Amino acid sequence: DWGYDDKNGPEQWSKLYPIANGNNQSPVDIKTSETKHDTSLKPISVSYNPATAKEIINVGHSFHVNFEDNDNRSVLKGGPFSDSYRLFQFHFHWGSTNEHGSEHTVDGVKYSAELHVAHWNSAKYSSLAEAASKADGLAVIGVLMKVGEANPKLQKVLDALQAIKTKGKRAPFTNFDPSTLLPSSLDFWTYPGSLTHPPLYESVTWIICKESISVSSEQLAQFRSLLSNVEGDNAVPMQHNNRPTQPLKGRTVRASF
Ligand SMILES: [Zn+2]
After folding, report:
1. Which of 90, 85, 66, 65 is nearest to 74 (CA)?
2. Spacing, Cα 62 to ligand 1 middle (Å)
């Protein structure tokens, strides 16, 4: 079983998942002096239907907000993509303290947390399960979260956590459009990469926003007070779930700006 502690964590993952030492691993440090501006990149277009919001789940290492993905009610288009990608989930990563917590870094700078909005290629594939292992199967928008002012758009999500405190708990989570969590500028970086935890498939086209969103110290505390243990066991707070940055191995990070 994999996690984030020292026995089962990022430095150990290569034992059952050798792709952890692959050539297209994520996250990465984005060095802005080494990025290549690409005039061919189109604007990012998101069109999400709040009716697709389904469920919030404590998954032990994190929590997930899942969406109905049976049709194209909620889609990502544009950027580097010719295909339409269907929303299926969003989640966050965070760290032990405010000083770290993001997965991607920019010129070496670590942010406090990171939002991931994940989609699958419904133009080419019939299901998430099919798409997840294909090079062009997944598209994830990453948004760096900078500690500062409380973010009111996080409210519904944070209010839901009291109902899913321990591992395996789940609740309906409905009528929510996660494009409300995105920054006002959708200027972005893009590079070919991977899932940031097992199974670590190199199936993700990353879209990293240039503009951060805010999160308060107390909002981050709410993430960290989720519990990784099952109900009735000794409490084990979910202190962190960010992977260290990985070698670019010659990949190019492109800029839309
Ligand atoms: Zn993630």
Report:
1. 85
2. 9
Residue 64 annotated as binding site:
yes
Distance 124 CA to ligand 1 centre (A): 23
Cis check for the bond before 27: say yes or no (omega within 30 of 0).
yes
Structural biology method used: X-ray
CA dihedral sign, ordered 139, 228, 150, 156: positive
Contact predicate 21/14, CB 8 Å: yes
Tokens at 233, concatenated: 């066991």
92 CA from centroid of ligand 1 (Å): 6
Q: Which residue has the tokens 């919001």?
A: 53
Resolution (A): 1.4
Instruction: Give the residue numbers marked as catalytic.
Output: 61
CB 101 within 8 A of CB 111: yes
